[PDB]
Amino acid sequence: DFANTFLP
Amino acid sequence: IQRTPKIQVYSRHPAENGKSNFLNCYVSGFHPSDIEVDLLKNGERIEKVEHSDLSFSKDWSFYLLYYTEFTPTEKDEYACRVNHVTLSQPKIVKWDRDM
Amino acid sequence: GFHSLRYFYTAWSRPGSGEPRFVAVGYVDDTQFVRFDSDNASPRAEPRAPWMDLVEQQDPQYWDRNTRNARDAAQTYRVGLDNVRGYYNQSEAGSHTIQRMYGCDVGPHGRLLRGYDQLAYDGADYIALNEDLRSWTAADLAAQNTRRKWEEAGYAERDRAYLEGECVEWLLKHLENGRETLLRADPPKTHITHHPIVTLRCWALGFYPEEITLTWMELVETRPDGNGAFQKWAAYTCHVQHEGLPQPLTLRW
């Protein structure tokens, strides 16, 4: 799976 | 950061006239990612050319493979025409059978 | 020695041409196995290596789960492009790029050797997860806006959990399910060609993994062949070192 994405 | 593309034009297998092959144009080392790549046959644009999914190297520079099936002949001339913001005019690299 | 599961995201704005575009790809070692492209209509995560045509058998929700993640990531990095543009006091008129690379290096026995999560803005380092997976390093002053946000939000802990857990587990699953693709060590097909002007050219074709040593000059960059393998040439004896060769080969015209 893809990891989490965090907003810059 | 802006980086101009490196270009290699080549076939998947050693070219033998009359035998089916793949014409490849590998563009790498560039930034930003928007790039125009055309494969040319006797100077004309080959339709339905496909490309690999956009990826990049550890230095953040992008790389793409453009490709199409083709059957080499003795006289037909193939090239790859690349345009990019770093290029004051489009760059043409001719396919050479022996590289 | 080890194996790696590596993901690559690129998001870029296109002012005047609609919403930003988002592309994600995943690799195990030198083999790409998944892609997502937000410009597709109803875009989905899609397989790009043979074993991923079978993952639905043991994991029927794989494609829905990762499509949902990627669609969400595309929307997040659309706003992320606006945020970072603002941190740098940039105008809305130009195109800018966010890139992310993350993944895990895993040695024999399945132990995490290194986890990473790095971001770039306009082709230069922006922020990175520290090797301890517990804090972040901003590459410049503008990126401290993100570092402060991510520190307070506790996102290193979420990355740490993925990199130590899911990343390693998925790498092991893909290595076994994809054995015939990933665990092969295909040696180069090698030969010398001869062109008088005289040029000797040593070829290495169809090899995997990408690492190779070619020695005799002009040495071209290693290039994909389009079928999942690689090529190189160098243009007296030519010597070839590759993982798939029991011993270094020697060739002459």
Residue numbers in the entry:
A (entry chain C): 1 to 8
B (entry chain B): 1 to 99
C (entry chain A): 1 to 197, 202 to 220, 231 to 249, 260 to 277
The authors write:
Major histocompatibility complex (MHC) class I molecules (MHC I) present antigen peptides to the surface of antigen presenting cells (APCs) to active T cells through interaction with T-cell receptors (TCRs), which play pivotal roles in antiviral defense. The α1 and α2 domains construct a typical PBG that contains two α1-helices and eight β-sheets, and the α3 domain and β2m display typical immunoglobulin (Ig) domains and underpin the peptide binding domain.
To elucidate whether the peptide-presenting features of a bat MHC I molecule can be influenced by binding to human β2m, we solved the structure of the Ptal-N*01:01 heavy chain complexed with human β2m (Ptal-N*01:01-h) at a resolution of 1.6 Å. Comparing HeV1/Ptal-N*01:01 renatured with bat β2m and human β2m, the structural conformations of both HeV1 peptides in the two structures are also similar, with an RMSD of 0.228 Å in the two binding grooves. In addition, the overall structures are quite similar, with the RMSD of 0.564 Å of all atoms. And the key residues binding to α1α2 domains and α3 domain of the Ptal-N*01:01 heavy chain are highly conserved in human and bat β2m. It indicates that the structure of the peptide loaded in the groove of Ptal-N*01:01 was not affected by the substitution of the β2m subunit.
